[PDB]
Design a protein around this motif. Structure first.
Motif, PDB file in Angstrom:
ATOM      1  N   UNK A  21       0.858  -1.058   0.003  1.00 63.65           N
ATOM      2  CA  UNK A  21       0.160  -0.058   0.121  1.00 63.65           C
ATOM      3  C   UNK A  21       0.930   1.217   0.090  1.00 63.65           C
ATOM      4  N   UNK A  22       0.204   2.286  -0.602  1.00 62.25           N
ATOM      5  CA  UNK A  22       1.161   3.426  -0.891  1.00 62.25           C
ATOM      6  C   UNK A  22       0.070   4.770  -0.285  1.00 62.25           C
ATOM      7  N   UNK A  23       0.676   5.304   0.744  1.00 65.36           N
ATOM      8  CA  UNK A  23      -0.089   6.433   1.315  1.00 65.36           C
ATOM      9  C   UNK A  23      -1.363   5.951   1.751  1.00 65.36           C
ATOM     10  N   UNK A  24      -1.585   5.025   2.300  1.00 65.75           N
ATOM     11  CA  UNK A  24      -3.037   4.416   2.815  1.00 65.75           C
ATOM     12  C   UNK A  24      -3.975   3.723   1.799  1.00 65.75           C
ATOM     13  N   UNK A  25      -3.458   3.743   0.502  1.00 67.42           N
ATOM     14  CA  UNK A  25      -4.299   3.287  -0.498  1.00 67.42           C
ATOM     15  C   UNK A  25      -3.484   2.127  -1.141  1.00 67.42           C
ATOM     16  N   UNK A  26      -4.369   1.347  -1.963  1.00 69.21           N
ATOM     17  CA  UNK A  26      -3.778   0.051  -2.434  1.00 69.21           C
ATOM     18  C   UNK A  26      -4.637  -0.328  -3.611  1.00 69.21           C
ATOM     19  N   UNK A  29      -4.026  -4.998  -1.563  1.00 71.21           N
ATOM     20  CA  UNK A  29      -4.674  -5.725  -0.648  1.00 71.21           C
ATOM     21  C   UNK A  29      -6.172  -6.229  -0.235  1.00 71.21           C
ATOM     22  N   UNK A  30      -6.938  -5.746  -1.566  1.00 72.76           N
ATOM     23  CA  UNK A  30      -8.333  -5.875  -1.538  1.00 72.76           C
ATOM     24  C   UNK A  30      -9.246  -4.970  -0.700  1.00 72.76           C
ATOM     25  N   UNK A  31      -8.673  -4.098  -0.165  1.00 67.02           N
ATOM     26  CA  UNK A  31      -9.313  -2.942   0.815  1.00 67.02           C
ATOM     27  C   UNK A  31     -10.204  -2.266  -0.175  1.00 67.02           C
ATOM     28  N   UNK A  32     -10.244  -2.038  -1.486  1.00 68.56           N
ATOM     29  CA  UNK A  32     -10.988  -1.273  -2.409  1.00 68.56           C
ATOM     30  C   UNK A  32     -11.255  -2.057  -3.726  1.00 68.56           C
TER      31      UNK A  32
ATOM     32  N   UNK B  36      -7.670  28.720  -8.133  1.00 67.07           N
ATOM     33  CA  UNK B  36      -7.378  27.990  -7.031  1.00 67.07           C
ATOM     34  C   UNK B  36      -8.306  27.068  -6.283  1.00 67.07           C
ATOM     35  N   UNK B  37      -9.397  27.416  -6.316  1.00 69.83           N
ATOM     36  CA  UNK B  37     -10.655  26.684  -5.582  1.00 69.83           C
ATOM     37  C   UNK B  37     -11.007  25.534  -6.542  1.00 69.83           C
ATOM     38  N   UNK B  38     -11.082  25.785  -7.892  1.00 72.54           N
ATOM     39  CA  UNK B  38     -11.443  24.958  -8.870  1.00 72.54           C
ATOM     40  C   UNK B  38     -10.193  23.832  -8.776  1.00 72.54           C
ATOM     41  N   UNK B  39      -8.786  24.267  -8.718  1.00 72.93           N
ATOM     42  CA  UNK B  39      -7.639  23.169  -8.551  1.00 72.93           C
ATOM     43  C   UNK B  39      -7.807  22.502  -7.188  1.00 72.93           C
ATOM     44  N   UNK B  40      -8.320  22.888  -6.215  1.00 79.15           N
ATOM     45  CA  UNK B  40      -8.369  22.309  -4.898  1.00 79.15           C
ATOM     46  C   UNK B  40      -9.291  21.149  -4.939  1.00 79.15           C
ATOM     47  N   UNK B  41     -10.566  21.635  -5.581  1.00 76.82           N
ATOM     48  CA  UNK B  41     -11.863  20.644  -5.661  1.00 76.82           C
ATOM     49  C   UNK B  41     -11.394  19.658  -6.574  1.00 76.82           C
ATOM     50  N   UNK B  42     -10.848  20.089  -7.654  1.00 77.13           N
ATOM     51  CA  UNK B  42     -10.421  18.807  -8.869  1.00 77.13           C
ATOM     52  C   UNK B  42      -9.526  17.851  -8.218  1.00 77.13           C
ATOM     53  N   UNK B  43      -8.357  18.297  -7.412  1.00 80.18           N
ATOM     54  CA  UNK B  43      -7.799  17.444  -6.770  1.00 80.18           C
ATOM     55  C   UNK B  43      -8.109  16.574  -5.662  1.00 80.18           C
ATOM     56  N   UNK B  44      -9.235  17.107  -4.834  1.00 80.70           N
ATOM     57  CA  UNK B  44      -9.854  16.501  -3.925  1.00 80.70           C
ATOM     58  C   UNK B  44     -10.805  15.289  -4.441  1.00 80.70           C
ATOM     59  N   UNK B  45     -11.299  15.611  -5.798  1.00 80.32           N
ATOM     60  CA  UNK B  45     -12.251  14.593  -6.266  1.00 80.32           C
ATOM     61  C   UNK B  45     -11.490  13.269  -6.536  1.00 80.32           C
ATOM     62  N   UNK B  46     -10.350  13.029  -6.425  1.00 80.04           N
ATOM     63  CA  UNK B  46      -9.478  11.919  -6.497  1.00 80.04           C
ATOM     64  C   UNK B  46      -9.569  11.027  -5.253  1.00 80.04           C
ATOM     65  N   UNK B  47      -9.796   9.700  -5.608  1.00 78.60           N
ATOM     66  CA  UNK B  47     -10.293   8.641  -4.482  1.00 78.60           C
ATOM     67  C   UNK B  47      -9.067   8.151  -3.938  1.00 78.60           C
ATOM     68  N   UNK B  48      -7.898   8.152  -4.416  1.00 82.18           N
ATOM     69  CA  UNK B  48      -6.433   7.660  -4.031  1.00 82.18           C
ATOM     70  C   UNK B  48      -5.986   8.425  -3.072  1.00 82.18           C
ATOM     71  N   UNK B  49      -6.410   9.509  -2.757  1.00 85.22           N
ATOM     72  CA  UNK B  49      -5.810  10.428  -1.666  1.00 85.22           C
ATOM     73  C   UNK B  49      -6.042   9.753  -0.155  1.00 85.22           C
ATOM     74  N   UNK B  50      -5.385   9.867   0.724  1.00 90.97           N
ATOM     75  CA  UNK B  50      -5.626   9.503   2.128  1.00 90.97           C
ATOM     76  C   UNK B  50      -6.520  10.680   2.886  1.00 90.97           C
ATOM     77  N   UNK B  51      -7.093  10.428   4.141  1.00 91.34           N
ATOM     78  CA  UNK B  51      -8.047  11.458   4.712  1.00 91.34           C
ATOM     79  C   UNK B  51      -7.135  12.740   4.990  1.00 91.34           C
ATOM     80  N   UNK B  52      -6.036  12.753   5.318  1.00 95.41           N
ATOM     81  CA  UNK B  52      -5.185  13.920   5.711  1.00 95.41           C
ATOM     82  C   UNK B  52      -5.164  14.846   4.361  1.00 95.41           C
ATOM     83  N   UNK B  53      -4.715  14.313   3.368  1.00 95.83           N
ATOM     84  CA  UNK B  53      -4.676  15.171   2.195  1.00 95.83           C
ATOM     85  C   UNK B  53      -5.822  15.659   1.708  1.00 95.83           C
ATOM     86  N   UNK B  54      -7.193  14.935   2.005  1.00 90.34           N
ATOM     87  CA  UNK B  54      -8.422  15.696   1.560  1.00 90.34           C
ATOM     88  C   UNK B  54      -8.696  16.576   2.703  1.00 90.34           C
ATOM     89  N   UNK B  55      -8.375  16.368   3.921  1.00 90.02           N
ATOM     90  CA  UNK B  55      -8.572  17.499   4.860  1.00 90.02           C
ATOM     91  C   UNK B  55      -7.979  18.775   4.776  1.00 90.02           C
TER      92      UNK B  55
END
Lengths: 54, 55
Positions: A21-26, A29-32, B36-55
């Motif tokens: 996993x990479x920065x909490x996502x993968x 591992x089957x998590x998603x 800059x707001x459109x940039x922040x929202x378009x980056x936040x749309x990604x599901x590969x980020x962890x919760x801290x990046x989204x916050x």
């Protein structure tokens, strides 16, 4: 002895699958089921289906 | 009397141009923050980020 080494390898396999996993996502591992990365400025995604290796 | 009265019209026109210049000076930063707001929202749309990046 072959049985004990077989069980040790299955445990190491499950551990290595857990650690993939990479920065909490993968995608291993089957998590998603999938991760939707950006494809264009409008927000369209480039889906990448997850491939579980657990 | 008419030619003397025209000076107030010129002053009002110059005052209106100054007001529009101030509005454009504000619109510059408003458009930049919207970009800059459109940039922040378009980056936040990604599901590969962890919760801290989204916050």
């Amino acid at each position: 002895a072959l049985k004990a080494d077989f069980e040790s390898l299955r445990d190491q396999l499950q551990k290595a699958a857990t650690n993939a996993k990479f920065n909490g996502v993968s995608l291993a591992d089957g998590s998603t089921t999938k991760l939707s990365f950006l494809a264009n400025e409008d927000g369209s995604n480039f889906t990448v289906t997850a491939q579980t290796l657990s | 009397a008419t030619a003397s009265s025209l000076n107030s019209v010129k002053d009002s026109l110059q005052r209106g141009q100054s007001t529009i210049d101030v509005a454009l000076a504000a619109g510059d930063t408003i458009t930049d923050l919207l970009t800059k707001m459109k940039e922040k929202a378009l980056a936040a749309s990604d599901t590969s980020l962890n919760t801290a990046s989204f916050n």
